[model samples]
Target: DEPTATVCDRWGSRDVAGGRYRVINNVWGAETAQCIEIGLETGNFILTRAEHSNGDNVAAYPAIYLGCHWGACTSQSGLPLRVEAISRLQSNWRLTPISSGRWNAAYDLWFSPSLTSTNGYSGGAELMIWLNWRGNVMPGGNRVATVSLAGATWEVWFADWDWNYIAYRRTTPVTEVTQLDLKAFIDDAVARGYISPTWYLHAVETGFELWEGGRGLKSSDFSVTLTAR
Candidate 1:
C-alpha cells in the first residue's frame, strides 16, 4: 500500500512517485476550505473537503501533473516537448465521482510558444478535455465545432483572454480512459489555427474543476507516456 498525505494549504503541493508526478491543492479563485488526500505512489488523489459555493467561478483545481507547472518541473517527464517533435503523446486515466457536485472531470493541458515559458504565458494556450460533468457546469467560451477525435466525439469551445482557452467536451461521458491520444487534439487545433505547431507542451494535468461541493471526487488512476519523434 502507498503512503498518503493530506494537503490543505491554498497552494500546497507534494511530489510523488519519486518526483515524477506532482499533486497540488491549487485553490486559487476563492476563499473556501479545501484539501486533497494524495496517494504518494499511485499519483491518485481525492478531494476530501471542498466548501466552495461560487456558481460563477471555479473555486479550485486540485490536480496532478507531469512535466513543468509554474516552474515546478518533474523528472524525466519528457514534457515541455515541442508539438512538432512529438511522435505520440498518450495517457490513461480513471475517475470516481459522486453525482452531487457542480464540477467537471477534465484534463487541463498547457502549451506555450517558448520552451522557457514555464508559467504558461507569452502566447500560451489552455486546452481542457472534459470527460464528465454535472450540475450546470460547462466548458469556457462558445461552441466552435463538433468533431471526432481519439475514437470519441467532442464539442470544441474557445475563449481568449491573457491567453487562449480551448476546451473539448466529450459527447459521451466516461469514467475511465485508456491510451488517450493527446497529440490528436493538438493536431486538430493546429489545423484550425488555434494552436501553433511550434508551441511547446508545458504540462498535462488531470483534476476536477470544482464550482460547488466536490468532496469524494477522486482521481483513482492516472498516467501519461510521451514518445518523441
Candidate 2:
C-alpha cells in the first residue's frame, strides 16, 4: 500500500524558515537502503532513514517551504470580485459550487429582451444565467440579466453567450475581449434572433482553490472576449 503523508508547517512563523532531523530506529528489517531524499520550498525540516531495520519500521523526514513560515500570504491587491446576486426581470441566475479535477465552471445561455405572450410569465424581459461544477449547482443561483432605467424601455445583457469555464484552479484564468467585441457579437446574435436587441459581456475569475497539494503551482485568473458578428 502507498503510505499516506501529512504536511506540517516548519515553524510557528509564516515566513521563510528551515530545520534539521535524524532517523531514530532501524526496525523495518532492511539491512541496506537505496537512497534518501529531502525537499524544501517555503518551510524547513530534516529527514533520515536507517540502512536496515528489524520489524515494522518508522522514520521521520524534514520538509520545508521557503515562504510558508506561518501560513499563506494575502495578495497586495484586493481579492477578486464576488458576484453574489444578479437579477433581470423574471430571469435570474447564480454562481454554482466548485468540484475537483475540473476546477472551473461556466454556462452558456440565450434569452430575449421582449417577453412575448408566447413565452408567458413576464413583467419585463431579461436573460437568465447560472453556473455549476462537477454537476453541482450553487445555492441561491439566481441573478438578474436585465435592468430598467427611468423609461419604459428596458436594457438587457448576456454572459459570454457560449460555453466557458467559470472557475479555475492552480492555473491562469482566460481573458475576454473588450466592449467593442461584445457589442459586435451581440449585434450578430440579435440579427440571428437568438437574442433581442441586446448586448453581452462576461465576468470571470481565478475562483477558489487556486493551488493544489504540490509546490510551485498556483491558480489562474478568468478571461473572455467579444468578436465580430
Candidate 3:
C-alpha cells in the first residue's frame, strides 16, 4: 500500500516495495511544512517559505530511494559495480514552481565504495540530473564538458561536496518526460571517466532543491525502477 507524510518538522523515512524503496521527508528547512506520498512511486513537497539564498540549505528533498540501505542493491555493495544488463530507470515528472523561489527540479544520485546505512550521503559522489530549474540558483563547480545520452545533450559540471559531484545538466529544460533510459546516463559517466568505475552506485533520488519561498512548488507524476548486480 502507498503511504503519505503530510507533515515533517524534521527528517523522516518509510520502507515500501517490500524494502526496495524508501520514501524520505528530508526537509532540513529550519522551518516547517507538509508533504505527501501520492503512492509508492509518486510524491511531492510543499514549501512554506522562500529559502532563495542560493546557499546549500535545501528546503526539502522528499524522495524515493533505490534500496532500503547500502548493500541492499547488491549483495556486494558500493559503486564501480557492473549494472545488471536488465537494470533500468524511468521518471515521468512535472513541477509547478512559484515565480519567486529559486529552485531546481532534478534527480540526485549518490555513490560510495563503502556504506552500511543511508545516513551519510555527504561522503559520496553526488550526481545531479537537472531537468529544470528556476531563478538565481546555479551549479556549484566548473563546467566540465558536454555529452549526449538518453536522447539529450547535457553539459557536465563539477564541484566538491564532501566527496565529489558531477552534474549532467540538460542544455534545455525537460520539465516532463517518460520511459527515459536511466542506464544511459550512468554508462556515459562510466565511459567518460566522470565517475570512477571503482566506486559503487549506492543511492538514487529525485525531487526539488529549493532556494527561496516556494508555496506551490510540487513534484508530480513521478516514478522510478532500478536493478543492480
Candidate 4:
C-alpha cells in the first residue's frame, strides 16, 4: 500500500483511483510556488501554478504513477534494472492548456545506478515523454535524431546531463491517448546506447512540468497501467 505523500510537502505520493494508481507531487527545486489538488476517485488531477523558467532545476512534476494493469504492483519495489520478460507501460490522460506559465505537459522518467533505496522516487537517466508542450522551453539536447515508435513520430533529442536525458517528443501535440506502447521508446533508447538493459527501470510517471508562472492547469481522465513481464 502507498502512503499519503502528496498531502504535505515537496515529495510524496498517494494511492488513489481505487489503489490502481499513485498521485505524485514531486516538487524538485530550490524554490516552489505550486499547489496540487489530487484526490481519491476523482476524474482529474488538478495542478496549480508555479515557476520554473529556462535553466531552472525543475519546478514541479505533478503526476500519477501507474502500478500494474493485470493486477497490482507492490508499493515496495526497487530499481528492477532489467526485466525477465516483456513489460507494458500504458496510460490514458487528458490535458488542459496553461494560460500563462511556460511548461511542458510531459512525462519525466528517471533511472539509477542502484535499485535499493530509502529516499524519494529515485532515478538517474531521465527519459522524458512529452505529450504536448507550450511555449519555447526545450529539452537538454539539440534535435539530433528522429525515430518513429510507440504510436507517433518522435523527434529524438539527446542531452549530456549529470545522468543523461533522452527526450522523445511527438512532432504533433497529443491531447489524448487511448493506447501507447511505452516499451517501444525504452527499447529505442537501448538501441541508441542512451541507456542499457542493465539499468533497472526505476520510476514511471505522467504529469505536467511547469517552466514559468501559470493560470493553473487541469489534469482530467488520467490513468496508467505498467505491468512488468
Pick the TM-score winner: 1
Worst 10 residues of 2 by lDDT: 60-69
Candidate 4: give the clashing pairs: 52-211, 81-200, 101-213, 111-124
Query: Candidate 1: lDDT of 212?
Result: 91
What lDDT is obtained when candidate 1 is compared to the true structure? 0.89
- Arrange candidates, best lDDT first: 1, 4, 3, 2
Give the alpha carbon lDDT tens digit for every residue of 114-201 in model 2. Answer: 2122332122212222122232223121222332222222223322323211110112222221121122322333443434343222
- The C-alpha TM-scores of every prediction are 0.97, 0.20, 0.76, 0.81
* Ranking according to TM-score, highest score first: 1, 4, 3, 2
lDDT of 1 by residue, 1-229 (tens): 7999999999999998889889999998898999899999987999999999987799999999998888788888887888899999899999997879799999998888877754556577888999998896978788999999999999999987677888999998999999999888889888888888888888999999999989999997789999999
User: lDDT for model 3, on a 0 to 1 scale?
Assistant: 0.62
Better of 3 and 4 by TM-score: 4
Quick one: best lDDT, which candidate? Answer: 1
Greater lDDT among 1 and 2 belongs to 1
Error of 1 at 188 (Å): 0.7
lDDT of each: 0.89, 0.22, 0.62, 0.65
Model 4 weakest 10-residue run by lDDT: 68-77
Global fold similarity of model 4 (TM-score): 0.81
In candidate 3, what are the lDDT values of residues 19-99, reduced to their tens digit? 545666666654645454434434444444334343556666666566423333422222333333325655555665556
Candidate 3: segments with Cα more than 4 A from true spot: 1-4, 15-20, 29-57, 68-87, 118-123
